[PDB]
Amino acid sequence: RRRKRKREWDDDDDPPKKRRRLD
Amino acid sequence: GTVNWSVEDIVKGINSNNLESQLQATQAARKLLSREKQPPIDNIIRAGLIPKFVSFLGKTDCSPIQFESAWALTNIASGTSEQTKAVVDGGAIPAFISLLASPHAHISEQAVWALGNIAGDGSAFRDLVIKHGAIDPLLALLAVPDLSTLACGYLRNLTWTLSNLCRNKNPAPPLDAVEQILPTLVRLLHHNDPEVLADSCWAISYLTDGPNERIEMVVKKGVVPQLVKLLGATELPIVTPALRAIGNIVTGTDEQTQKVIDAGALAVFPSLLTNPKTNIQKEATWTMSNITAGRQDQIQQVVNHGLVPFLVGVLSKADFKTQKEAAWAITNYTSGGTVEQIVYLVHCGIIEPLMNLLSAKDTKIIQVILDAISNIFQAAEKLGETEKLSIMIEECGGLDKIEALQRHENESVYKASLNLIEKYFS
Numbered sequence: 001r002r003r004k005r006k007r008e009w010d011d012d013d014d015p016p017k018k019r020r021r022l023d
Numbered sequence: 024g025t026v027n028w029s030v031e032d033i034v035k036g037i038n039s040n041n042l043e044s045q046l047q048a049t050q051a052a053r054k055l056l057s058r059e060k061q062p063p064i065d066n067i068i069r070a071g072l073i074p075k076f077v078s079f080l081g082k083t084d085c086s087p088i089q090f091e092s093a094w095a096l097t098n099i100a101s102g103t104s105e106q107t108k109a110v111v112d113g114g115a116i117p118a119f120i121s122l123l124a125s126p127h128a129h130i131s132e133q134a135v136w137a138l139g140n141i142a143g144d145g146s147a148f149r150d151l152v153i154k155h156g157a158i159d160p161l162l163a164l165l166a167v168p169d170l171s172t173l174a175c176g177y178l179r180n181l182t183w184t185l186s187n188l189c190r191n192k193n194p195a196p197p198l199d200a201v202e203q204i205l206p207t208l209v210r211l212l213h214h215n216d217p218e219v220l221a222d223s224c225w226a227i228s229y230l231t232d233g234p235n236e237r238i239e240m241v242v243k244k245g246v247v248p249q250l251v252k253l254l255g256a257t258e259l260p261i262v263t264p265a266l267r268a269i270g271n272i273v274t275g276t277d278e279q280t281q282k283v284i285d286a287g288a289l290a291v292f293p294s295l296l297t298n299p300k301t302n303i304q305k306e307a308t309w310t311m312s313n314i315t316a317g318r319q320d321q322i323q324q325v326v327n328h329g330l331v332p333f334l335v336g337v338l339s340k341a342d343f344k345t346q347k348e349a350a351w352a353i354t355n356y357t358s359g360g361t362v363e364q365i366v367y368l369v370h371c372g373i374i375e376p377l378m379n380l381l382s383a384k385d386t387k388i389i390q391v392i393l394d395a396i397s398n399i400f401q402a403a404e405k406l407g408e409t410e411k412l413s414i415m416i417e418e419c420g421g422l423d424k425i426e427a428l429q430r431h432e433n434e435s436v437y438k439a440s441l442n443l444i445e446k447y448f449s
Contacts, residue, residue, distance in 0.1 A: 001359035002316050004274045005309075005351070007232050013263060013302055015225060017143040017187070020101035021094060021136065022057050 025051040030066045037075050042085060049079060049091040056098035064102045073099070073113040080118040086127050093122065093133035100140040107144045116141065116155045123160040132177050135161065139184030146191045153188065153200050161185065165207050170214050182211050182219045186226035195233055201240060205230075209244050217258050224253060224264035231271035238275040242282060247272065251286040259300060266295065266303065270310040273317075280317050289314075289328040296333040305345045308337050312352035315359070322360050331371045339376040343383070350380060350391045357398035365402040369412070374399075378421030386433050393428070393439040400447055413447050422448060 028036075028051035036048025052072065056062045067073075072095075079085075079092035096119075100110040115137070122134035138157055142149040164181055167173060173181075185204060189196060211223040227246065231238045250272075253265040269288060273280045295307035311334060315322055325331065334356075338349040353373060357365055380392055396416075403412045416422050425448070428440035 002355045004313050004316055006274050007267075007271060013267075015264075017145075017190075018101040018107075018140045019136065019183070020057075020062070020098045021133075022059065 025054055028052075028055065030055075030063060030070050033067075034070050034072065037072060042082075042088070045075075045079070046085065046088045046091065049076070049088055049095060052076075053091045053095045053098075056095050062098060062102075064099055064106050067095075067099060068106065068109050073109055073115075077113045077115050077118055080115070080122060086125075086130060089122065089125070090127070090130050090133060093119070093130060093137060097133060097137040097140060100137055104144055107141060107148065110137075111141060111148060111151070116152060116157075120155055120157050120160060123157075123164065128174065128177060131164065132180055135164070135177075135180050135184050139180070139187050142184065143187040143190070146194055149188060149191055149196065150194075153197065158188065158200060158203055161188075162203070162207050165210075170210070170219075175216060178214070178216065179218050179222070182222045182226075185211075186222045186229070189226040190229045192233060195237060198240075201230060201237075205240070205244055209246055212246060212249050212253075217261060220253060220256070221258070221260045221264060224250070224261060224268060228264045228268040228271060231268050235275045235279065238272055238279055242272060242275075242279055247282045248286040251283070251288045251291070254288065254291050254295075259303075262303065263306075266306050266310070270306055270313070273310055273313045277318050277321070280314060280321060284314070284321060284324050289324055289330060292328065292330055293333055296330070296337055301342045301345065304337060304341055305348060308334075308341075308345050308348035308352060312348050312355055315352045316355035317359070319359065319361055319364070322356060322364055325356075326364060326367060331368060331373075335371050335373055335376060338373065338380065343385075346380060346383075347385065347388050347391075350377075350388050350395070353377065354391045354395040354398070357395050357402070362402045362405050365399060366406070369399065369415075374412075374415050374421070375419040378416060378419050378424055381421070381424040381428065386436065389428065389431070389436055390433070390439065393425075393436065393443065396425075396443065397439070400443070409447055417448075 025047055033048045033052045036044045039045065052067060076092040076096050079088045082088055096110055096115055100107045119134040119137045123131055125131045138152055142152045161184065170178060188204060208223060208226055211219055214220065227241060230241050250265055250268055253261050254269060256262050269283055273283050292307060295303055298304050315325055334349055334352055337345050356368060377392055377395065381389060383389065400409060400412060403409045425440050425443055429437050431437045
């Protein structure tokens with residue numbers, strides 16, 4: 001029986017870190 | 024009026040000793056920084072305007088200049104780490120936190136937004152914002168009987184900033200800060216606005232990405248059933264983070280994984296494993312792989328829910344990334360499963376697509392596949408059915424593929440394949 005595989009790092013589907021207000 | 028000022032004029036207005044002139048110039052800066060294309064953030068920074076903007080945040084007697092400078096600083100802080108740093112270096116953090124108490128909702132909201140950008144930059148600024156005491160006043164803004172009475176955009180900004188306080192690792196947020204935030208997060212997770220739900224799910228997904236202790240503190244709040252409900256939402260921006268959170272949770276203990284199963288999650292997987300968005304199929308297949316790494320009774324649930332034919336499906340045809348996760352799910356299944364469960368796997372047609380994937384250049388997946396094949400032979404040995412399997416691999420072109428692998432570059436690959444041949448194919 002194998003171990004679980006934790007999430008491998010990645011920012012692709014990840015939402016923006018920051019937001020600029022346009023109006 | 025204040026449209027399209029040069030930085031030079033803005034500096035002139037702000038350096039005047041006239042509060043109205045300063046207000047006018049500050050608004051002009053806000054508009055440059057809010058324009059559609061290429062805000063001149065560095066030019067504003069080089070002009071040395073940040074300390075002035077920060078001092079304007081403290082002018083209780085002139086709420087508009089508070090708003091305008093809050094907005095300008097927010098947009099500077101929305102840029103690169105270096106640009107965010109310039110805002111922090113100016114002393115903006117405590118000034119923004121003080122503004123959270125403002126009687127003017129539009130100013131309080133803007134400060135919420137700014138702190139979100141600062142915390143959003145990474146672990147260090149996130150933790151610095153926390154050390155300055157942001158959490159208490161942020162949470163206080165949400166301490167109402169019914170979230171529905173709050174202005175929609177306002178609630179969205181609050182939720183988003185809270186999600187940035189939950190975000191990033193190396194290190195993950197302080198445990199006590201996470202405990203402090205969680206009950207409000209649980210509440211937001213039951214709100215009916217799609218964007219609040221999306222961002223709440225993102226926050227939960229960040230919090231469950233780590234050591235099992237981290238997962239536990241989220242899971243003991245009883246959010247799993249609600250996450251599973253959101254897993255079946257029609258909005259992709261909700262399903263995506265909800266699924267990421269469910270995936271993270273099943274990387275945990277057998278018990279944490281069982282909560283996901285108990286909450287009815289598996290019933291959504293026929294849709295997820297055939298979802299038009301390839302990223303959903305990948306995350307869903309990754310999730311399945313961690314569930315098939317679970318207990319034999321958890322594997323049985325995968326079986327009962329009819330999900331094995333869905334795994335054969337993605338193994339057979341999907342983007343390559345998803346196929347790799349499917350391969351993992353199969354190796355995990357065959358490593359932990361009973362002989363009967365493994366036999367069932369073969370009867371669903373796993374062998375052919377499994378063999379076809381051996382044409383893949385990926386060295387790691389080849390190892391995964393060879394292992395699985397080894398595991399399946401080991402089950403056929405208990406049943407004396409080894410030869411039925413050899414023939415099965417022979418007729419779908421698998422043996423040809425195992426043969427070539429004997430000459431593969433990787434050590435464990437040719438070693439694994441030589442063993443298979445000189446054992447079951449002699």
